[PDB]
Structures are given as C-alpha cells and as structure tokens.
Design a protein around this ligand. Structure first.
Ligand SMILES: [K+]
Lengths: 31, 100, 157, 120, 49, 246, 238
RNA sequence: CAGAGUGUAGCUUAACACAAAGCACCCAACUUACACUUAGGAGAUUUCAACUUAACUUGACCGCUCUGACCA
C-alpha cells in the first residue's frame, strides 16, 4: 500500500513550518 | 507550550499501538515475499523437469527490464476534461562551479 | 610457536577484508545484475527521504548489498502563470524537486521480479521510482562543473 | 589480605576483585549476578523467577532493572556480601537502567567498590 | 629482547618475564605490564603460557 | 618443522570464500557474548582454567537430601499466565511502569522466593561457603525445609541468621529461637557446629548445640543431647563459620 | 515430444490508480505527526508577516505614524481567505467512480485504489471456465515469449504491458478428466508470468462475456478451487 | 474426499526445575541513511483423556507436508 512509508514528519532540527497542499497536475490528478 | 499530562499520556499510548500495527505490516509484507519466492522457485523446479532448455532461458537476466520507471499513485484520478491554466516553468537552480 | 600444534591460533587477518585507500562499476553476470541505481524523485522532501529509508531497510532484510545511499542536488523550479485578461506571466509558486538514490548491487536475475513488485507497491503518492543501471556519467553528475577545464579544453578542440 | 588476581591489563574486564556484580540483559528478562573471581555465583536475582515476575508489569524495562537491584541488595546482605566491583561498558554505564540498578544496590547497603588489599 | 623466564620457571615478584617491542605475549594473572610492554611477575610462582 | 593440530582449530568453521556475504558482529556486545562462550568450552591446548580453576571431582556430588516436591507444571503455568494478564490489564500498572514509579514489595518477594527458588539458592550459597565440602565431604543436599534461627538481642530486637550474615559472639550468648514448619508426629534433630573454631585439630569441629527427637517444631521439648555453648572464635584467627543443620 | 502439454499464462495486472484510504489508527498517527511537526518547527514567512501585520496595525492605533505600510494593503489572513475561495471552487476527481456503483467488472475505471487482475473466459470441452489469458508454447520461442504472444491474440486489445523478468511466478498442473486422456496427451502445465498494464484497454466491440478485471479478494468467484490456490500465491494484495 | 508422515511464536537437539528460554523481529530518538547504542513493543506449546505426571509418552481431535482420487 502507498501508506507503507507515507506517514512522516520533517526530520530536521531547524526548519520552517510547512503546510499541506494539493498539487493539481496538468491532467487533473492531485497529490 | 508544555503538554498536559493527559496529552502526553495519550501520545505515549498511541505510539505503543503504532509499534504493534507496524509489526503486523512487516509480517504481511514478509509473508508475501516468502509466498512469491516459494511459488517462483517451485515453478522453476517444475520447468526444469519438463524442459531443461526452457529453464536455462528462464533463469537468465532480461536486458530490457531496466530502466524500470513507475510513478506513485495519485490522490484523486485524472479529470477527463480539465483545462490547466497557461503558464511557464523557469528553472532557477543554482549552478555550483569548482574553481582552484 | 611454529613447531607446536597450536601454531596460528592467533591468526585473524584472513577473517577481515583487506583495506585499500574512483570505484570500478561491476557489470552483472548472466544470472545477476550489476550495480543498480534506484532513484526516488518527489516534490516533497519527506516522502522521498522516507521511501529511500524504506528501500534501504528492505534491502537489508533481503540481504541485498547497498553500495551507497546518497541524495542528488535539489532542483528549484519557478511556476509562472498567465494572469487573467493579461499577457504578463506572474510568479505563482516555487516547487522544489528532491531526489534520493539507493545504490544496490548483486541483485539476482530471478529475484529481480519479486524485488521490483514490492518496491513499487509501497511507493507513496507523488513519488516517482526509476531503477537504472549505474554508469560513470551518473557518478560524474554529482560533482561541480569545472569552467576552467572547459575553457582550456575548448582551446584544444 | 587475600590475593586479588592482578594483571590482564590488555584485555577486558579486569580480574582484580574478590566479588563482582554482573548484570545480564536479554530480550525478555533482566538478571543480576554476584560471583566470586573463581567463577562461582554467590547470589542472584532474575526476572525469570516467579517471586519477582509476579509483581512486575514488564520484566524488560527500567523498573525491572531497579527492582532487580533492590532484591539483589537484600540477598547480598543475607549472604554476607557487603562489597563488590561493577564493570560496565561505556554505553551500559551511561544507560538509565544501570544507573537506577546501581542506586538500588547502594541504597540497599551494598558498596560497589572493594577495599584495597593489605600487603603490609 | 625476548622471554627471560620460560614455561615452568620459578619467578620472584618483580622478575621480568619477557621484553618485547610489540605485544607478542600478553599479561595474564599475576603478571604486570611495564610502560614499554615489559612483562613482569607480580607474585612468586611458576610461569605458565 | 610443523606439527598438525591435535583437534579442531579456532575459526575453522568460518567459510572464507563468502567473506563479504557473511554476517559480522557489528557490536562489541555481540562479540563479547560469543567470546565468553568460547572461553568456557573445553580445549585441547593449555588454558588458564587448567592451572587456576579448582579441580572438581569428575563424579557428580551425591545427593543426600529430601526428595524434590512434585508440582503440576501445566496447572502451575496456567495460573501464572492468568496472573500476568490481570496485572497487565490494570491501567494504573502501565502508567507506573511507563513513568518509572512502580516498585516491587520486597517482603512478598522473599516469602515467594523462600517457597520456590530459596532452597536452590541456599544450596548454591552453602556450596560456595564450603559447608558441603567440610560437613559432608562433598555430598550436597537441597535445604528444602526453611529454617529460621534468630538470636534475641535485648527485649525488643532479634538478630536473624540467614546464610553467612555476620553475628557477633555477644549477640549469640544465649541459645537462639528456632522455628521451622513441621507436621505433627514428625521428629527432627538440630545441631550447631563451628567448622573453623577447633583449636587443636584442623579437620575437627566443635559441637556447640545438639537437640534430638524434637517433636514437631517444638524445639523446647527436644532432648538436650549437648547443652548450648556460645561461639568463641579466637582473637586474630579470622572469621569462623557456624552452621545449623536440621 | 512429452506427454504434458506446455502452456504459458499471463498475469496482467493494473496497479492502483489512487492511494489507499488511511485506516483509523493511521489517521490518528497522521494527525499526531502533523501536530508534532508544527510544534517543533520555526515560524514560517507567512506566520511572521501575519504577526508583523497585526503588530503594525496596533502601532497605527497607538500612534498616527504611517510608515507607508505598502505590504499592509493585503493582510496575511486576507490572502488566506482568497486562497480558500479558489479551493472551494475546484471540484476534485471522484476516487469512487461510476463503475464502482454500477459494479461493471469489465472496466479499468472501477476500484481505483486496489490492484486488478485480468481474467478471460475460455471454453474447454463444451464448458466455460475463467482463466488467466494463456497461449500454447511453440518451438523456437522462450516460455515468456509465449506470454508476450497472449496479448496479440486478445480480441481488439490496445494495451502495452511491461514484463518483469523471464522466470515464471507460478504453475498449475492438471490432468484431463478422462475425456481425451491418452499417453500422448496426459494433461497440461501452465506457467504464469506477471506483467504491468502501462497504458491501454480493450475496444468497445466486445466487453462483457470476454474478460473481467477483479481484485484478489473477489478472485475466487471466477476461478476454480485448485486453480485459485495456485493463483493466490503470486498475486499480492499488499 | 482417501493413504502416510507431521506438531513450541520465525529458527533451535531451549526447557533438570527453580522456569515456557536464547536469538531473530517491530516502533521511537541518534544517524544523509545504514550500523551501533538508549528507551519501548508483540508474541507460541492444536485440543482433551490416560502414575493427575508428560511442550516431551500413548490414544483420539485439529492444523500442516507429501502421495493418489477429483480436475480444463
Ligand atoms: K581451627
């Protein structure tokens, strides 16, 4: 399954906050 | 912000469940590789008895296997009639050069 | 002592691989592939890093030698979009592409099918898998471009 | 006044002791031994024992290691063992488990250092 | 440099058993090692390899 | 000149052709564990154990004690697993272990240990102290009947005798209070001997106390075959051993 | 020749089109991971601008000093409002398609999250049976080459399959049920080869009675007990 | 469906009893990652009856592995 290694967090000590967004591709599919 | 006792207790209990859930993911993935490997090896042994020449070709490497490219799944499927906006892509990657 | 039956009880250097102070690529045999590069490209750094970690750990479980695990240089791409009722392109978003490579060797001819099936099923969404054969060009692509050598080489041309 | 086994300076651990505390940690259990330099075990406390296991939620955590120290310290006093050496590795000594086991032994009365031999 | 006391030889405390530039022989029970890797007896007894 | 080994040499079963594919230790702890195992095995070359290890007799030690108790492992294992489930089910137990605030009751541990592993731990400890070597010329027994000896010191205190704990001659001036679990109609003999007290003869002992034909556990009603004598370890002679044998 | 007839089957698989839904525990862990990530992160540029903007709005109230405040024209929350409006206007593709509600087991569009296997119905001895596409081995051809040929024999198919390796991933050995059971023709031996459906699909001429695309769970409805036991070993459902 | 063999969680010729053990394994932190270390997690005798003993012996009962029937 795609969830095998998809539950993650930024493994850095110093990093700015990141926000989840949907990247709409050119065929309409999203990720 | 300091976490409350109830929160730290809820996070500790959730992670304890995560160890067992991931332990069962690996087991399913570890029993699938075994099943596939056994069936393949069993089939290859049966293919050697039937015809040795075909078995020799079966165990050879496939030159056309690589390069092997596969994209991951999408979140939502493609839209049949979706028109993307017009735009341009401008690569702004810094080029590093070694001097001396 | 030499004459005694216990001669050589303290030998140990035949049990260790010799250490030698770039690296020759070993082309695969008829039944085993050569050095293989497993590229993992994703628009999200955490997904590529997480899957590269999964593939490394999976290869350890399967006794597949991992020659090297390294990251390729990140590529930043500006995404301009034509404005409404206008001919000017305005900067919309900046998308970075992060790539991770898990370099393996010694993959078997028969087991290659099973290995590829497992590492594609666990592929996260938005992560691209590309299994290529290692070449000198792949290794050289990791190093800075030398402009001085190009100018001096151009004179010879 | 008894001889301690001096020497073995190039290997680990030392033999220069009369009694030593030796802790064995496995995947499921925690065992602590007090043994004489000649190799004889004097007293022991293990989470494999039902007397200890029945009171422990887990026999493999820090609490189990602290409990083994408290049980062993009492058994040491009943056997007459008041002194012993403990020979941990750098990572073992820094571990929170071993620090709690050592505190349990010292609070229980056992001294984890041995007196110097008298030569004269 | 070499063995000064062979197998079975009686030694006294302090007697140098062997001298070596490298650790050919290692110190055992009741055997000290000097700053220059010199092996000497810490007790009176019989040398054993 | 060379001589063939008298047996299998170390590091011989290692296949040197597949060295790169062989598993390595990777940790100091994994090598040490294997190293300690090899050191204990018998070898055909000269070893430290040969010259310094005590020369134990090859024949096993004759057992002269009471028969082991018969226990149903199946029922015992079932009850033990059930108890662990009940303890682990309690949520307050999990938080105490997770927060490292839990503790065991030492009083209960000793009571259970005295019923279960106590006898074997006492035998192992008695063998270390040399009692079986001296008292029974090497024959060993499992002390399956717990013996509780206590010297009354003052009017409100007791000095318990365990298995090697130090008791001073002043505390042992009078006969101790001896109590053990015994059925009705049984007979017992209790003695006290000083293994090391004897002044003239090295191999002999001193009989400090002898009580015979004790009915049940009523030690006071036994026949005083030998009256009680307090220990008299001589000055400068070291630490002596006094053993109560039931 | 040999008594056993050599056959080459093809296990053509359509890999998941969309990601699989998160389970209840995975959702809890995903929320915790998001919370931890926010907790240990530094302030983002957006957060800083919102803070400064709120601060600069305060000083204007306290003191009439303007300081241009060009960027203050649009606030950080005002931008967030515009971003959400455009999102609510876009309609995402349906992860559950019409074929999932109609239950059309002949279309690829159904069951996007799970893997599908191709099953073609073939008539043996006046009896219809569901089997993986197969062809008979012929001299001068590798055993995999027989599987590559099965696609060409498929009826009005425009599909490009990627074959993984040369070795077979399974086998099923059966004997004819006494019909044409002879020393020359004792039975058959099918060898399965896995392939991935890169792109393409069948035509609209003949769809229903020909083929179906089924997940591994609903794979037994069509295959036989013994034929199923051998197919459920190399068909993964990870 | 029949005939044989077979029986501790993944492996073990671990289990005398004092006890279901050792390793392998899963998560987290450290590590680019791996490894190591620390701190946690999950586990088994197929089920009953026979000196009551018995994970161990004999029987049935279950699961398993092959050999045939059944088979496209
Ligand atoms: K004496």
């Amino acid at each position: 399954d795609s969830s095998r290694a998809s539950l993650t967090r930024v493994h850095r000590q110093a990093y700015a906050r990141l926000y989840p967004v949907l990247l709409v591709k050119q065929d309409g599919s999203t990720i | 912000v300091e976490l409350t006792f109830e929160e730290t207790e809820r996070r500790a209990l959730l992670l304890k469940k995560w160890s067992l859930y991931k332990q069962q993911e690996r087991k399913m993935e570890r029993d699938t590789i075994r099943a596939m490997l056994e069936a393949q090896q069993e089939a290859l042994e049966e293919l050697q008895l039937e015809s040795p020449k075909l078995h020799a070709e079966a165990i050879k490497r496939d030159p056309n296997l690589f390069p092997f490219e596969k994209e991951g799944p999408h979140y939502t499927p493609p839209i049949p009639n979706y028109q993307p906006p017009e735009g341009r892509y401008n690569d702004i990657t810094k080029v590093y050069t070694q001097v001396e | 002592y030499k004459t005694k039956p216990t001669h050589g009880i303290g030998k140990y250097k035949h049990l260790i691989k010799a250490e030698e102070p770039v690296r020759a690529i070993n082309l695969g045999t008829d039944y085993e592939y050569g050095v293989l590069n497993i590229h993992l490209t994703a628009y999200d750094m955490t997904l590529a890093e997480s899957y590269a970690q999964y593939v490394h750990n999976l290869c350890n479980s399967l006794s597949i030698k991992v020659e090297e695990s390294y990251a390729m240089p990140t590529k930043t791409i500006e995404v301009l979009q034509l404005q409404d009722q206008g001919s000017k392109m305005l900067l919309d978003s900046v998308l970075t592409t992060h790539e991770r490579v898990v370099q393996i060797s010694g993959l078997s001819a028969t087991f290659a099918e099973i290995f590829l099936e497992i590492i594609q099923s666990s592929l996260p969404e938005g992560v691209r898998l590309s299994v290529k054969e290692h070449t000198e060009e792949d290794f050289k692509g990791r190093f800075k471009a030398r402009p001085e050598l190009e100018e001096l080489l151009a004179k010879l041309k | 006044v008894a001889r301690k086994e001096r020497g073995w300076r190039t290997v680990f651990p030392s033999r220069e002791f009369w009694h030593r505390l030796r802790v064995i940690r496995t995947q499921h259990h925690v065992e602590a031994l007090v043994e004489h330099q000649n190799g004889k075990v004097v007293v022991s406390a293990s989470t494999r024992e039902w007397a200890i296991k029945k009171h422990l939620y887990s026999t493999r955590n820090v609490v189990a290691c602290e409990s083994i120290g408290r049980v062993l310290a009492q058994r040491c006093l009943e056997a007459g063992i008041n002194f012993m050496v403990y020979q941990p590795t750098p990572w073992e000594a820094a571990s929170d488990s071993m620090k709690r086991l050592q505190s349990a032994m010292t609070e229980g009365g056992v001294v984890l250092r041995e007196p110097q031999r008298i030569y004269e | 440099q070499g063995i000064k006391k062979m197998e079975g030889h009686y030694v006294h405390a302090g007697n140098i058993i062997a001298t070596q530039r490298h650790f050919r022989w290692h110190p055992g029970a009741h055997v000290g090692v000097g700053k220059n890797k010199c092996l000497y007896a810490l007790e009176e007894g019989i040398v054993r390899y | 000149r060379r001589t063939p080994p008298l047996g299998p040499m170390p590091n011989s079963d290692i296949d040197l052709s597949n060295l790169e594919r062989l598993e390595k230790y990777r940790s100091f702890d994994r090598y040490r564990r294997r190293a300690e195992q090899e050191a204990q095995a018998p070898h055909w070359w000269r070893t430290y154990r040969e010259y310094f290890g005590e020369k134990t007799d090859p024949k096993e030690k004759i057992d002269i004690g009471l028969p082991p108790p018969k226990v149903s492992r199946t029922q015992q294992l079932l009850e033990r697993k059930q108890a662990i489930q009940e303890l682990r089910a309690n949520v307050e137990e999990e938080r105490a272990a997770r927060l490292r605030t839990a503790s065991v009751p030492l009083d209960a541990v000793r009571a259970e240990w005295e019923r279960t592993c106590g006898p074997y731990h006492k035998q192992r400890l008695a063998e270390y102290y040399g009692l079986y070597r001296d008292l029974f010329h090497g024959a060993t027994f499992v002390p399956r009947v717990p013996l509780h000896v206590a010297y009354a010191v003052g009017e409100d205190d007791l000095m318990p005798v365990y298995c090697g704990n130090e008791v001073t001659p002043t505390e042992a001036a009078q006969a101790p209070e001896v109590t053990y679990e015994a059925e009705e109609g049984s007979l017992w003999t209790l003695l006290l001997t000083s293994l090391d007290g004897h002044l003239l003869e090295p191999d002999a002992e001193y009989l400090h106390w002898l009580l015979t034909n004790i009915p049940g556990n009523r030690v006071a009603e036994g026949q005083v075959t030998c009256p009680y004598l307090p220990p008299f370890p001589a000055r400068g002679s070291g630490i002596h051993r006094l053993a109560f044998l039931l | 020749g040999s008594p056993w007839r050599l056959l080459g089957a093809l296990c053509l698989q359509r890999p998941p089109v969309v990601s699989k839904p998160l389970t209840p525990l995975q959702e809890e862990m995903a929320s915790l991971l998001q919370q931890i990530e926010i907790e240990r992160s530094l302030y983002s540029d957006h957060e800083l601008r919102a803070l400064d903007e709120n601060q600069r709005l305060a000083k204007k109230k306290a003191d009439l000093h303007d300081e241009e405040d060009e960027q203050d024209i649009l606030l950080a929350q005002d931008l967030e409002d515009m971003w959400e409006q455009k999102f609510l206007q876009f309609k995402l593709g349906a992860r559950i398609t019409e074929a999932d509600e109609k239950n059309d087991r002949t279309s690829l569009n159904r069951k996007l999250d799970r893997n599908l296997v191709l099953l073609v119905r073939e008539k043996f001895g006046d009896q219809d049976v569901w089997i993986l596409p197969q062809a008979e081995w012929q001299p001068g051809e590798t055993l995999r080459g027989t599987a590559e040929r099965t696609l060409a024999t498929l009826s009005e198919n425009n599909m490009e399959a990627k074959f993984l390796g040369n070795a077979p991933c399974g086998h099923y050995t059966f004997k004819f049920p006494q019909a044409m059971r002879t020393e020359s023709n004792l039975g058959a031996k099918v060898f399965f080869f896995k392939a991935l459906l890169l792109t393409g699909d069948f035509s609209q001429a003949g769809n229903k009675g020909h083929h179906v695309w089924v997940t591994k769970d609903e794979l037994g409805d069509y295959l036989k007990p013994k034929y199923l036991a051998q197919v459920r070993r190399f068909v993964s459902d990870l």
